[PDB]
Design a protein around this nucleic acid. Structure first.
Lengths: 63, 141, 228, 247, 60
RNA sequence: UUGAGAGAUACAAUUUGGGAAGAAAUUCCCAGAGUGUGUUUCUUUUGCGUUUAACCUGAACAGUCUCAUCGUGGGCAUCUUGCGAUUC
């Protein structure tokens, strides 16, 4: 039964690989639901380059 | 100004439903199969019932039998077919977001155009600040 | 150019080009009857799209045993202006005669003017609650599909299918909960309708929710045994 | 490798050479093969030092330049007791232009060891604060936010000054070092000090600096050096550029 | 341990499992459908019961 | 803070099942489900306190006269910098 089942699997891999969306499984589902239904400043473009990343030690160390 | 905006809006609306005509929407419903016995209830597997492979079962647009199981003409379709199919969805989405933007644009001068005609106007103000206009109850002859 | 692929149901195909569609082989060449696109690939075809055809949503959602077959007779219950009766003519071929019933006059003028072009379809313009009123036409249609929207869907099937259907035949029915109750859950409506069909010597096979095209709709298929 | 040896001879001569008796800061400079395309603005992007803190903010003279009304900017940060013993003096930008002008910017440079301004009026700074500050990056004006809330399009600016979060920025900005991006390859960062700590402390300060600058992820604050670093050269402000990491 | 015992009773008394996306319902017998009246449902009888026994009239 | 019911499920438990190679075990393409601990949204059981709420309406914007709409002029770039929308 290995000869007939391999031919069925060969036709199955011919269609399922060529009629799917592997990397587009998320975007073509989010856009289909829409069809059927680091701080950024507005005016100063130098906000995100120069700001200090505040850590927990910077909020706690009273020193 | 009101005629031009609705003409662009109805252009994008007609291209939307024309864009929905040749597009494909996959269905994921509650496809349920009734059974007559408890012994067939707990031995059920869709690969057993549809007598086909697992990757063939989950696709709903077609589910071919193993008897019916006995490609790349759109060449390199692993990046060409899925992106171009996504681009038709993207164009319909750009049809929709342009249309609902033109709907909000049209309504904003249509309230302005009806503000100029006649009657006793009265400017009401919402507590959130959204202004509107409520009119007197005068029957225009 | 377009890669073609036959469906699990015979007689209906899927055109897998760069865009994807569900497509049927034409019977009337060079004639669309409500403005539908086509692919000639040779044999000229015709497209479906489920947003106005409630059978097409049942096809696209995945139907296990479409009793509409490419050599079988189909009773179209509720022929809404030939928008899908012309489609089931393309999927059964010139082999079995497809019967269409309707009440209203606006679909009736569209049915007769389109059944002039199509010899597969014969239109009946009489009430579907009275199968004796058109008893002079049908004997054991090979399957029946219903798309009626009058709140006796179970009775209008049990009246027609008890004497116009082949034994061990298939019965299809489109039921929507907005017609019948429109105030409870949809699943309890369809649970009511399958026990309604169970009392009429019909074993319900499959029910499918038609969610992305027709909200609050359904398609029930099943076998019908041992009368008529 | 030999980075410990290079820092050893640099530390030994800087307390011995009469010319190098006064420079107390240590710089590594980076020359790359390709030129990074972003031209030299005057907003210093800062980088963290994940293990060893450089300076704690209670040993540096800190000048803040604020907005023109400057009432609650002055009032809240002086009477919060999170920042009350932190800021040296607070000046509005219009009053800074009017009061400190001429040769008094030199004594403002000498007396006050660090300058920081809000993101509102930092671009207006170099024409009122002088070209003496913009000779390198010793007293380049650093960056602080003030409100911890954003402004969208057509929204009215709601004025707020939270002292705890701006104190945590000065904690986050004095504990480490900063880079200013340049058009050509040669950029210099001031890592470590001669007497704040020692050679193994500077060595991992070097390693955390080159780890952040060569990060191919984390683009807008970190993805500045592209490809690979050709070499790095440790120096003081007046010494020679001692070589390490030849390839 | 009897909390697990009636949990198992709910397991054999259930008649609908959701095999993946698909669902399967068990069909009851024809003799029980014809020779027995249908169940009352809780929404129609409790609407009458707590209306009659509402606290606006001092029952009890 | 209850009595259960219905799930997306986050970790683990051998499985159930189609295909392939596993001579002997594996293991892959996978398709799920079940169980415990999670974490949970909603339905009713539950006791006390409270019979008032919410919205609309009548002749209900306007002598500090108000509202449109087009223009003009000046502020706010240390930024309501202004959408066929309303920056003041």
């Amino acid at each position: 039964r290995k000869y007939l089942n391999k031919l069925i699997k060969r036709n199955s891999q011919n269609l399922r690989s060529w009629d799917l969306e592997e990397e587009v499984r998320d975007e073509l589902e989010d856009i289909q639901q829409s069809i059927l239904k680091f701080v950024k400043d507005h005016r100063y473009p130098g906000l995100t380059p120069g700001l200090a990343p505040v850590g927990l030690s910077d909020e706690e160390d009273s020193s | 100004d009101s005629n031009y905006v609705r003409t662009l809006r109805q252009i994008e609306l007609k291209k939307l439903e024309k864009g929905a005509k040749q597009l494909m929407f996959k269905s994921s419903g509650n496809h349920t199969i009734f059974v007559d016995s408890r012994e067939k209830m707990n031995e059920f597997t869709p690969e057993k019932f549809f007598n086909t492979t697992s990757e063939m079962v989950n696709r709903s647009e077609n589910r071919l039998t193993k008897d019916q199981l006995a490609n790349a003409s759109s060449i390199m379709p692993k990046e060409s077919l899925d992106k171009k199919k996504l681009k038709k969805f993207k164009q319909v989405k750009q049809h929709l977001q342009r249309e609902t933007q033109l709907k909000q644009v049209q309504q904003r001068m249509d309230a302005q155009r009806e503000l100029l005609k006649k009657g006793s106007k009265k400017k009401i103000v919402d507590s959130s600040g959204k202004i509107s206009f409520k009119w007197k109850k005068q029957r225009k002859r | 150019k377009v890669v073609i692929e036959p469906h699990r149901h015979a007689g209906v195909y899927i055109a897998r080009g760069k865009e994807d569609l569900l497509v049927t082989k034409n019977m009337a060449p060079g004639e669309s009857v409500y403005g539908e696109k086509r692919i000639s690939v040779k044999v000229e075809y015709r497209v479906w799209n489920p947003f106005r055809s409630k059978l097409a949503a049942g096809i696209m959602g995945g139907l296990d045993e479409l009793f509409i077959a490419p050599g079988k007779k189909v009773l179209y219950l509720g022929a809404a202006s030939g928008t899908s009766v012309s489609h089931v003519s393309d999927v059964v071929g010139p082999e079995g005669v497809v019967y269409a019933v309707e009440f209203s006059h606006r679909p009736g003028r569209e049915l007769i003017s389109m059944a002039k072009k199509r010899p597969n379809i014969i239109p009946i313009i009489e009430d579907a609650r009275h199968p004796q009123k058109y008893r002079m036409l049908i004997g054991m249609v090979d399957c029946v599909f219903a798309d009626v929207a009058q709140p006796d869907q179970a009775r209008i099937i049990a009246l027609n299918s008890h004497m116009f259907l082949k034994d061990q035949g298939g019965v299809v029915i489109s039921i929507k909960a907005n017609c019948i109750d429109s105030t409870v859950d949809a699943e309890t409506v369809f649970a009511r309708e399958v026990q309604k069909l169970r009392e009429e010597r019909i074993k319900p096979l499959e029910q499918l929710t038609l969610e992305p095209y027709e909200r609050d709709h359904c398609i029930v298929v099943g076998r019908y045994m041992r009368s008529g | 490798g030999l980075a410990e040896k290079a820092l050893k001879a640099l530390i030994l001569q800087c307390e011995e050479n009469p010319s190098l008796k006064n420079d107390k800061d240590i710089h590594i400079i980076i020359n790359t093969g390709k030129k990074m395309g972003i031209n030299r603005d005057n907003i210093p992007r800062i980088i963290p030092l994940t293990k060893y803190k450089l300076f704690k903010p209670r040993d540096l003279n800190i000048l803040l330049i604020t907005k023109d009304p400057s009432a609650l900017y002055r009032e809240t940060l002086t009477k919060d007791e999170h920042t009350s013993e932190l800021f040296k003096e607070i000046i509005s930008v219009k009053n800074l232009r009017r009061r400190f002008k001429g040769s008094k910017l030199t004594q403002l440079y000498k007396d006050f060891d660090l300058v920081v301004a809000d993101y509102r009026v930092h671009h207006l700074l170099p024409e009122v604060l002088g070209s003496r500050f913009y000779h390198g990056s010793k007293k380049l004006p650093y960056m602080i936010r003030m409100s911890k809330e954003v402004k969208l399009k057509r929204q009215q600016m709601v004025e707020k000054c939270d002292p705890i979060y701006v104190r945590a920025q000065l904690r986050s900005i004095c504990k480490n070092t900063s880079y200013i991006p340049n058009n050509d390859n040669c950029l210099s960062v001031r890592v470590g000090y001669i007497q704040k700590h020692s050679i193994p402390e500077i060595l991992q300060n070097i390693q955390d600096t080159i780890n952040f600058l060569t990060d191919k992820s984390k683009r807008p604050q970190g993805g500045v050096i592209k490809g690979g670093i050709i070499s790095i050269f440790v120096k003081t402000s007046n010494s020679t550029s001692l070589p390490i990491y030849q390839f | 341990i009897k909390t697990k015992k009636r949990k198992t009773l709910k397991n054999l008394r259930k008649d609908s499992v959701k095999r993946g996306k698909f669902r399967v319902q068990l069909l009851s017998t024809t003799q029980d459908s014809k020779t027995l009246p249908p169940k009352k449902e809780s929404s129609i009888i409790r609407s009458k019961d707590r209306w009659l026994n509402r606290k606006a009239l001092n029952k009890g």
